[PDB]
Amino acid sequence: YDWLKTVEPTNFLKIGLPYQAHPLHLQHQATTPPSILEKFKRADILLNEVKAEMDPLMLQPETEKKLFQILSSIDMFKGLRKKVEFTYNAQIVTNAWLKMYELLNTMNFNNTSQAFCNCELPGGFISAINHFNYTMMHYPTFNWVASSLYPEDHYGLYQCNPDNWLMQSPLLKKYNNGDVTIASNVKNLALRATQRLTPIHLYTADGGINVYNKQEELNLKLHFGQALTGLLSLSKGGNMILKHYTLNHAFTLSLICVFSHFFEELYITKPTSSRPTNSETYIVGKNRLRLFTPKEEQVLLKRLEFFNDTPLVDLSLYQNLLESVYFAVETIHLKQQIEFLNFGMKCYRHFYNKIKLLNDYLAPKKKIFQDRWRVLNKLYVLEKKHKLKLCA
Ligand SMILES: C[S@@+](CC[C@H](N)C(=O)[O-])C[C@H]1O[C@@H](n2cnc3c(N)ncnc32)[C@H](O)[C@@H]1O
């Protein structure tokens, strides 16, 4: 099992996207797509094919249990959350906490002080920024608004902190339930957010549904409201962190195209704390250069209002940017993710009946990787006076 003993830690994956000097026209017709879309389409079929390879295991509950066991066993960062939570006084240290924390430590944000964290429940992202802010930035006070589809708040971050969340309980249907697929909710959330916290230097949105062959597609309207909320609230100079997945659909591509008009730097990122076997990505915009015009605002909300995945811009005008995206898709999905799904199927085959053994083989490797993470994203102990109030 040498192939096991040689597994190496992943690297943080960061792919720069070019800003578009040119003025942004939001399309109202369909345009013939550029050739390169066939390439993204070829990536979608391939990535979907490898994923399919676990289909046979998903038919009997027995093999499906062994499948998740095997996936658990290969998760090199598993007991890191608990090490982090204890060693350093951290809170809501979900896997989301590590991702946001890793993002904070890599991206060199110019500012992380005024955070609007949307699709945030429970609140790992919020906790990560609180902790990073008070132990690394030392911002005198840290102010944040949050919102999420009202259901979960396992830790009582919504219950204890109601002057910060922007969505209502059903008992208020009378009303914004934090659902970012309703256009009127996104307008309202952005307004609320900018109504009690100015400016907004950091917007984050970690939304997703779950189900894999149409995961991106199922999530388009969600990832569009997510981003509409941000772009309607993020103040000039502010920063942005958005959860995406595959990035092969022409809408997603056109959405990234919109973004490239609004930041000094734009990147597609795959943090080591993002499972290497899933398609999760984090689009990251540093230094917002300008706000929406009043026309740009209306066109996008109406598209949210009456939604179709037709591209928002003429993709042919963004050839260079598109070549950069595919390069992230080649790096994150066609290589890394496919390399790691193959690796997990291989493990499954040689260890479906020997889980304990696989875990024994990988213990040394695990400690080294979690240790590396901690040395890469230095963590300090959070002062109890700077902790978030939790009701659970
Ligand atoms: C992966 S969790 C994100 C939170 C992350 N675990 C954290 O604590 O940082 C999924 C999130 O997406 C949100 N979400 C999913 N669909 C949504 C929608 N249509 N509108 C608003 N939020 C949505 C959920 O409310 C939830 O907070």
Automatic annotation (TrEMBL):
Disulfide bonds join 160-391. The active site is at 243 (proton acceptor). S-adenosyl-L-methionine binds at residues 123, 206. GO terms for molecular function: methyltransferase cap1 activity. Keywords: Methyltransferase, S-adenosyl-L-methionine, Transferase. S-adenosyl-L-homocysteine binds at residues 94, 123-124, 179-180. Transmembrane segments: none annotated. Residues 91-290 form the Adrift-type SAM-dependent 2'-O-MTase domain. InterPro entries: Adrift-typ_MeTrfase (IPR025807), mRNA_Cap_2O-Ribose_MeTrfase (IPR050851), RNA_MeTrfase_FtsJ_dom (IPR002877), SAM-dependent_MTases_sf (IPR029063). PANTHER family: CAP-SPECIFIC MRNA (NUCLEOSIDE-2'-O-)-METHYLTRANSFERASE 1-RELATED. This is Probable methyltransferase EP424R.
